[PDB]
Amino acid sequence: EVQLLESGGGLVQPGGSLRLSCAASGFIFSSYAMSWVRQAPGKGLEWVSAISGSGGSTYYADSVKGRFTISRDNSKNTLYLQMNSLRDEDTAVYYCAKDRSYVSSGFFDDWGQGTLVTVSSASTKGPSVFPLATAALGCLVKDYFPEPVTVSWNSGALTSGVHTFPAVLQSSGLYSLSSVVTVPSSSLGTQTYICNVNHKPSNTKVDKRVEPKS
Amino acid sequence: DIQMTQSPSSLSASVGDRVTITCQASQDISNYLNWYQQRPGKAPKLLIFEASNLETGVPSRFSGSGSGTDFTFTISSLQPEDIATYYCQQYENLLYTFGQGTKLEIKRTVAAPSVFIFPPSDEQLKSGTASVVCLLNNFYPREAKVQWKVDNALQSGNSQESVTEQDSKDSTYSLSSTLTLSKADYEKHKVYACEVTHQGLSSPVTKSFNR
Amino acid sequence: DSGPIICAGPIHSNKSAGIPHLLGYSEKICQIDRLIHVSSWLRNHSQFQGYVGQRGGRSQVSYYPAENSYSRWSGLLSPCDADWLGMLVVKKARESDMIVPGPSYKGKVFFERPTFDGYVGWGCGSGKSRTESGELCSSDSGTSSGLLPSDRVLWIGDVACQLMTPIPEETFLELKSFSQSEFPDICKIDGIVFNQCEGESLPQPFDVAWMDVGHSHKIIMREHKTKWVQESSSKDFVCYKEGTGPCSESEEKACKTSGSCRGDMQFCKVAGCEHGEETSEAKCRCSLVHKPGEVVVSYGGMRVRPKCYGFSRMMATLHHH
Ligand SMILES: *[C@@H]1O[C@H](CO)[C@@H](O[C@@H]2O[C@H](CO)[C@@H](O[C@@H]3O[C@H](CO)[C@@H](O)[C@H](O)[C@@H]3O)[C@H](O)[C@H]2NC(C)=O)[C@H](O)[C@H]1NC(C)=O
Ligand SMILES: *[C@@H]1O[C@H](CO)[C@@H](O[C@@H]2O[C@H](CO)[C@@H](O)[C@H](O)[C@H]2NC(C)=O)[C@H](O)[C@H]1NC(C)=O
């Protein structure tokens, strides 16, 4: 019932600005304080900012004070984070969280799915999606930037046995991952297998087919 | 202002064992401490609040205690779905601070990896780069090394490995080792071998192809 | 702003948590610092879930008039505080009880007013707060958490309550008649006969100095003298553990009767202390409560130690001319 949906993350160069949004549903938004908590890649949790139910009290961590602003629209039931003067230490997944009180209290009872903000001067590039031949198969998502990419199999109809590897950073400065799946080897002909590779930061959407060959 | 420290930073235990995590604050926070569990790929989840209270729906094997500066989070009997990193958090002060986290590994029986090898696609070969992918599927422990071989010559410094997070039911790992060559270097040689040695195999495995 | 007596403002984790009936004096004081008593009052008389005073505590309560002398002394007791200590009762309001003009009632969940014959509180239920006039509770989209800030509590008047020295009936009747002589124009205060008129005006706001001497009704005054006297009774001291919080009933009794605990300058003079022993550990320490002392009031050739004293707004009907 309670759900939080973040949006607005993406590539931004140093000194740039971004506005994050967090759409709330399933509860009386105006009765509860909200918080933003971030997590740099491979690191821990860092509380960023909080706001009372009405918006009359705001709070910020010293790492972001004066550069970030937190606000809310209680008719639209969405929470905002305006981030200016962005730096590399701001690169992180940003979560919104529902608190337990009108007053900011620190109980992070419900979390959004997170949205990624990457701070770099480098440029976007869509990925290349090559195939990979009980037997296993998969797709090779090569040479993209920035993160993330989401790989589906047969429009989500295939879930068992799927392993989508963490991306690796290449010497070229671009990312490359693989997604694989094991199928019971009587799948040649008897089944069709398609990997759905999405790279929203470049709008690249690809549906590759994987098949035996000769 | 208030700094939080967690120990251990990392921890390995097997299913059914008892797990204890400690968290300390630089000042008194009475019992104003929360504990969060962050499973691989998911947002953090509040397990205990006010240092001892179970959140709704949280299994009774989770518990916590402490007041003042020293606190404890306990899993009485480990289960495979507990694979996560655990964070403590003070809320005595409005400027909330987290501990650095404790990563919990699940020990289990040794499992040999299922090993596969994939040649470069033809569609990729026309861009002038060849990527050869070797896959290790559902093995434990994580420790395992892949040794590429081209005409029985040990490839060095031209591969990269990626490992998945521990599975929430299997407790296994999966590994990928991508060998990247040039198309000119790729079509100079015939035999491309992926040799896996791992504790769950009496003898090393080799999965190779002829192009 | 003031500060707490022993316990810092609460951070409640559950609006459905029960309020424990505590026996220790410092235990009760701790509940008073955290507005546990107003929340208990709200749950009882108004069917309200949760607490008021989240993170703010008693020190962040709002007052009418806003600039409040006795607010600055954390140890002086409001009518609500004395009610929790069982010294008096703040009754639930009835339709007849006149809501006074002047306070900013909007968004308030509880407000309290000393009346001529007692002390009266007005509450609101879950999800609602008071309208601009205070007459009604209306839906408040910011209150549904049940964990509300302190300024939702309004205490009307500049009031101090304390342990009274009981006075005989002859003293009260003489004090009664002197007040009638000082206010010949008044007929009724808060709907209660003050003089006999037949010729009254409509109810009218009335800012008056008064005192509770534990009889039928209060005693209002124009010219009076107030003096604060120090008494160094055990009720003037609160006992806490460092880390644990307020001491239990038995630990507090031991400290105040056996000179076995630690304390500040004043406590060791009164009940006695002991140093040179404290290892790492943590035992109970007792410190003086921040107040001017007990108020003693001269009025009409007499001098009393009253239960309560202060300057607050009541409603009065005057003589028609
Ligand atoms: C709101 O209602 C509750 C429920 O009645 C009130 O709590 C009650 O307060 C009375 C008076 O302090 C307590 O009485 C005492 O009971 C003990 C029994 O353990 C007895 O030893 C004493 O002699 C005394 O009679 C009573 O225990 C307590 N009840 C509960 C359940 O806590 C509360 O005072 C009301 N709040 C307000 C602001 O009116
Ligand atoms: C908040 O307090 C209420 C009141 O005690 C808790 O409700 C009880 O929860 C237990 C545990 O599931 C049940 O066995 C009781 O039947 C519940 N009683 C009532 C009256 O609801 C509630 O669980 C507490 N919330 C949290 C998060 O601890």
Residue numbers in the entry:
A (entry chain H): 1 to 133, 143 to 223
B (entry chain L): 1 to 211
C (entry chain A): 21 to 341
Please give sentences taken from the publication describing this entry:
The genome of SFTSV is comprised of three L, M, and S gene segments, and the M segment encodes a membrane protein precursor that undergoes proteolytic maturation to produce two glycoproteins: Gn (the N-terminus) and Gc (the C-terminus) embedded in the viral envelope. To elucidate the molecular properties of SD4, SD22, and SD12 binding to the SFTSV Gn, we prepared protein complexes of SD4 Fab, SD22 Fab, and SD12 Fab with the Gn head and determined their structures using X-ray crystallography.
SD4, SD22, and SD12 bound to domain A at similarly-perpendicular angles. The buried surface areas (BSA) of Gn in complex with SD4 and SD22 were 893.4 Å2 and 891.7 Å2, respectively, which were slightly greater than that of SD12 (853.5 Å2). Specifically, SD4 and SD22 formed eight hydrogen bonds with Gn and its associated glycan, whereas SD12 formed 11 hydrogen bonds. This weaker interaction may be attributed to H-V103, suggesting that a V103Y mutation could potentially enhance binding affinity and neutralizing ability of SD12, which warrants further investigation.
